[PDB]
Amino acid sequence: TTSIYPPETSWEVNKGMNSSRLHKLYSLFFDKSSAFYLGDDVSVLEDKPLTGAYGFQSKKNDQQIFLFRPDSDYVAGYHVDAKSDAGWVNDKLDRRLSEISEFCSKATQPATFILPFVEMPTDITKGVQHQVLLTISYDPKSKQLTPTVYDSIGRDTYSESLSSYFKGKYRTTCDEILTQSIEKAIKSTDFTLGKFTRAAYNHQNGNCGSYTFRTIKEVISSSAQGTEVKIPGSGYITSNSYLTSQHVQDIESCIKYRNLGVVDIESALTEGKTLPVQLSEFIVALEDYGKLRSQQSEIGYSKTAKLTAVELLIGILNDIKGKNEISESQYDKLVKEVDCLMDSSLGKLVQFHLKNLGAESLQKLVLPCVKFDDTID
Amino acid sequence: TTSIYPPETSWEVNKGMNSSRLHKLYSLFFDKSSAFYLGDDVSVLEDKPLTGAYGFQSKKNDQQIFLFRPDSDYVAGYHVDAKSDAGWVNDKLDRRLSEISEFCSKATQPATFILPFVEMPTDITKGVQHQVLLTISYDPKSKQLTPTVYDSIGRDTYSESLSSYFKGKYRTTCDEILTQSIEKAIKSTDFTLGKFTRAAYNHQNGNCGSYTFRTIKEVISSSAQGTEVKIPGSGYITSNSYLTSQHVQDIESCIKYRNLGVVDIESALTEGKTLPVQLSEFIVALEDYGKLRSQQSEIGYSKTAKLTAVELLIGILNDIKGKNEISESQYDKLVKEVDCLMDSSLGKLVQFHLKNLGAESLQKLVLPCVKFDDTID
Ligand SMILES: [Ba+2]
Ligand SMILES: [Ba+2]
Ligand SMILES: [Ba+2]
Ligand SMILES: [Ba+2]
């Protein structure tokens, strides 16, 4: 168990997802600068905790929404070979299903449970893991609950499609073992099991993670009321309108440039709070850029140039955090390095932080806190 | 512990290396069709086993060569931040170093120990692991032994180079902790420690694995006698001449198309044997192609077309293995699918296997074993 979610500079959406990153992204849900912001609901009065998840009262409804914090251990393996057994669900995931069942056994209000999880083939050697989303909606008056999976990799086109017969020899997904796990989680045969369905969308053939996150937003908002809206018809025209570029830079800037504790997040979705960006984060980001840039592995600006720049910027940033102040000479030295710190990736980092610090530039940011006298060097 | 090394179709060199694959590649060392073939030496008379490694008497020398079977656990982590401590070496790797030291404490003949291992930064979040190679050469009359590391990622160019000063703030490699582990492995202060050196070659910035394998070959052959020959001067002109395309298709075809037990390998380097390709392998390869092709994830031929083809080919291949025979009708059905089974990747697979089965084509391969009568459908 590790408790911080560092800035991963040089991370991009095509570089794939994991439980920690996804959880970090959760912080966006209450940030109004963000297109993932839910002003569609509020938190659940401090009761009914349902461990592992964050609760939400609908502002527009009597409907309650429980979104699970992601887990390295929510995983479903499936056997692609169909002579083999359908698969396994990880005993924690199974556990959470049993727990939903038990939350619903006593529930006076309609609920929706949103669990993100990883779906993988275990026969083959690739072991592509794709980020994927389960939601279970329960109605008390209807005495029943309906499973659904939202799958981003839902490409396949007729040429690459599978015949009814060959489907018999080959599993492309974990639906068999998963439905099994669910009808196992409820049996007093207490509940009617609504039909299991799977929502696929356009042509992915590892961006799955980010679509999953977007879908969580869509799934929550759409539950204040309204049908579920995803790409391939019954929704958005294109994948690009659905997950917009403003959704993307939001996600990327979050992962790429921020340093967030898990406590900070937990508080943030418990109290319906936004997490503003501390200056300490700017410093950590710079440091990580710094470490990564110095690497050799997987009047233009050089490595030692970039590094001296980061060193100096870091220094100044600290002396600002230090009570204290900046000195004239230091301001000059920064000015010489400004055009370098605004260059490329490092620039994007810096612009992110200046934007969220309420400063137009490095000079503007740094200009107060400077002590002057007379003529200085 | 898993004991087979399946064919990974769709694997390519740019897709990176691991302990099992690398070990599988070891099988090429005695195959004369292969450019990795050592007709430069023979095995060690069955004595002096030095557990974990394979021994070799030099045909041209009194020199002994011990190449280690790779391990998921031979790993060196290093801290890129230099205010931090240099790193860690995995207690197994350390263990093997202590064991070399002890083999050399009693040794009457000059030896060279070749250990492949993975080198990684632990501060940063990427955790790029790059396949890398240690060799330790001991002389009894010189009372001493010399460490060397061969590093393929040895790119960096002056712009992306690191100043003497910034080297002080940043580690790009595991040399510090590694040299430490070595001078720790010998202290009675019994041995003189030859100077630790590191051989880098051209411009990689994850092919590292395959270069490492090539280097093992170079390191072994070059030890029958001769200086060590790698790319950046003191060797081959270009990386492409060093690791030739004939080296590459050898490696790829090995990983991609073969099914090899670890027992088969162990025997093969113990007895100096070649492993010819069983027909069973062809069948396994086809099956794996089959599984992977049916997947949706990370008059032209369709998925269901390709699959029916594989199904039929597999069927026929089995009936061949089954004592038994093929039937006329079956031969026809194959003929209809021939142009499909020769297409693209599947084709490359099939051509690999036909080449190593002593058959010009599918029809030629399958043509005996067919029973005829009169006019058949
Ligand atoms: Ba289970
Ligand atoms: Ba039923
Ligand atoms: Ba150790
Ligand atoms: Ba010394």
Author numbering:
A (entry chain A), B (entry chain A): 47 to 251, 256 to 348, 355 to 433
Could you share sentences copied from the article?
L. pneumophila inhibits autophagy by injecting an effector protein called RavZ into the cytoplasm. RavZ functions as a cysteine protease and irreversibly deconjugates mammalian Atg8s from PE to inhibit autophagosome formation. Unlike Atg4 that cleaves the amide bond between terminal glycine and PE, RavZ cleaves the amide bond before glycine. As a consequence, the RavZ-cleaved Atg8 proteins cannot be relipidated, leading to inhibition of autophagy.
Next, we solved the structures of two RavZ fragments, 1–487 and 20–502. Crystal structures of the fragments are essentially identical, solved in space group I422. RavZ structures of both fragments are resolved from residues 47 to 433 and 48 to 432, respectively, whereas the missing regions at the N- and C-termini (residues 1–47 and 433–502) might be flexible and disordered. RavZ shows two major domains, the N-terminal catalytic domain (residues 49–320, catalytic triad: C258, H176, D197) and the C-terminal domain (329-423). In line with the crystal structure, RavZ1–331 showed similar LC3-binding affinity and catalytic efficiency to the wild-type RavZ, suggesting the catalytic domain is sufficient for deconjugation of LC3-PE. The C-terminal domain has been recently shown to be involved in association with phosphatidylinositol 3-phsphate (PI3P) and be essential for membrane binding. Structural alignment indicated that part of the N-terminal catalytic domain of RavZ (α2–α4, β6–β9) shows a similar fold to that of the core-lipid-binding domain of Sec14, consisting of 5 β-strands and 4 α-helices (α7–α10). Similarly in RavZ, helices α2 (corresponding to α7 of Sec14) and α4 (corresponding to α8 of Sec14) along β sheets form a large hydrophobic interface. However, the hydrophobic pocket is closed in RavZ, suggesting that a conformational change may be required to accommodate the fatty acid chains. It should be noted that the LBS of RavZ is closed without showing a binding pocket for lipid, whereas a clear hydrophobic binding cavity that can accommodate fatty acid chains is observed in free Sec14 structures.
